[PDB]
Amino acid sequence: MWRLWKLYDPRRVLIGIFSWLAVLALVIHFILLSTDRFNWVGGAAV
Amino acid sequence: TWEIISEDAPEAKGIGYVHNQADADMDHPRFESHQFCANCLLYVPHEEDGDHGYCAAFGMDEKRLVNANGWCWAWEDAGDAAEVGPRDVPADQLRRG
């Protein structure tokens, strides 16, 4: 799988991964804040 | 004193008050073959009759007692009155407000 980087430019893969990870972590953190149970700063009870 | 109501009175005729569970409207929709006056939520036993008591459908009238083996389609389960109110209002706020 080392040959994967002879095909795909490392910078574009890493930028693509970083953009996906940033959007995904933001979306997961936001979804959690939207729920009553996992809003850690809303301070609700279970 | 405590006259017992007449089964042929219009108040009884209207609700089908029968002195005996047999001869009732057994083909009335609201009817289970376990409902008696003693089992009725609207029945308060009389202090010194032994067999009769007051009926809330008759305004708890002294001169309108009902036989404890009677029945009318106004019967409601004495299993009620255990819980009173909306069952989501706390008891603190239920009475008065």
């Binding site: - | 009175a9 219009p10 108040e11 005729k13 209207g14 609700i15 609201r30 939520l41 609207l42 308060v44 809330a56 459908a57 008759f58 305004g59 708890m60 009238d61 309108r64 106004a74 409601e76 389960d77 004495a78 009620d80 009155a81 819980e83 009173v84 109110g85 909306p86 069952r87 989501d88 209002v89 706390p90 706020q93 239920l94 009475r95 008065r96 407000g97």
Partner: protein, 336 residues
């Protein structure tokens, strides 16, 4: 997204675009099913006011019809609770529970609207079930929008606007339309009745126009209607260009205002804290409290005639023009 087929009806002249389009697959068909009326019990013998210790509203009913009414109301507002929803256990002469006082007001109101508001309800009338539909609470009530006493030097002052609200049918329109028109009696007219302006005689602001718009948003979705079923929107303020639905719903506004101002709000004092809205107010009636998204509540089923006791006496004081329209004799002091 939706799809065809859609039910279509013509409300105005061909080519005016006055049509109702409905999705048959969006109707509940269970919420609007009228309960099967009980058999007519006898109306003989002594009245209820002579039998019962504590009866003030249903005095002129027979014992049989009184108990038939009591059982019907139990199915309508609290089937899963029983008679002890309003009555304190076995003491049926007791008025301790708030639901008992509220229900006593609800019978007086149900009798009042059924006897005086045929200008809106015609002959159908209403029943406890028209609003409750088998529930302790009507699913379709409203509370007053909170008034937060804005900073006057801060930021983000929505003037009851600029937020998506189910009250305004997901518009940014004013959210206090119910308070102004369904409880208060503020003017709904927005159109000048002249070709040329007279700004010192008619100067309705666009904010007032959007408030009347927001009430119209509700009155459309609350009865499964749209602006076209009561209006020719090309000529919005022309009554002779409007279907007879507009005249009927005119009384629906004043009847809802009558229900809220004279019958519902007096109950606010003795409600439990859990029941009240954010402002501390009682849940109030809107157009959907009876209609639930259909032009004819409960499919226009005439339930009143089956139950003696929900019909009152035609008041000599009733006007339907004494609710903020040339006079305020049918409204109490408070309103809102």
């Amino acid at each position: 997204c939706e799809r065809p087929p859609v039910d279509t009806e013509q409300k105005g002249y061909r080519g005016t675009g006055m049509e109702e389009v409905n999705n048959p697959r969006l109707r509940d068909d269970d919420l609007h099913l009228a309960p099967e009326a009980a058999d007519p019990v006898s109306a003989e013998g002594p009245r209820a006011g002579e039998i019962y210790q504590n009866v003030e509203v249903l005095d002129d009913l027979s014992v049989a019809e009184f108990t038939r009414l009591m059982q019907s109301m139990t199915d309508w507002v609290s089937p899963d609770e029983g008679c002890t929803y309003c009555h304190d256990g076995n003491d049926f002469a007791s008025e301790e529970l708030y639901t008992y006082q509220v229900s006593r007001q609800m019978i007086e109101m149900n009798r009042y609207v059924n006897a005086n508001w045929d200008s809106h309800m015609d002959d159908t009338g209403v029943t406890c079930y028209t609003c409750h539909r088998g529930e302790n609470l009507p699913e379709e009530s409203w509370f007053a929008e909170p008034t937060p006493d804005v900073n006057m030097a801060g930021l983000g002052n929505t003037m009851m606007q600029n937020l998506a609200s189910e009250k305004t049918e997901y518009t940014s329109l004013p959210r206090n339309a119910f308070e102004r028109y369904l409880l208060g009696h503020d003017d709904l007219r927005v159109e000048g009745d002249t070709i040329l302006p007279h700004l010192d005689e008619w100067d309705v602001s666009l904010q007032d126009t959007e408030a009347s718009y927001s009430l119209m948003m509700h009155m459309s979705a609350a009865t499964g209607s749209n602006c076209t079923t009561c209006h020719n929107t090309g000529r919005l303020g022309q009554w002779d260009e409007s279907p007879e639905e507009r005249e009927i719903s005119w009384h629906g506004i004043r009847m809802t205002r009558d229900i809220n101002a004279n019958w519902i709000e007096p109950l606010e004092a003795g409600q439990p804290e859990v029941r009240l809205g954010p402002t501390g107010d009682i849940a109030k009636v809107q157009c959907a409290t009876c209609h639930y998204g259909e032009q004819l509540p409960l499919d226009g089923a005439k339930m009143v005639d089956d139950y003696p006791g929900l019909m009152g006496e035609e008041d000599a004081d009733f006007d339907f023009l004494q609710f903020g329209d040339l006079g305020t004799d049918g409204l109490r002091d408070r309103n809102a």
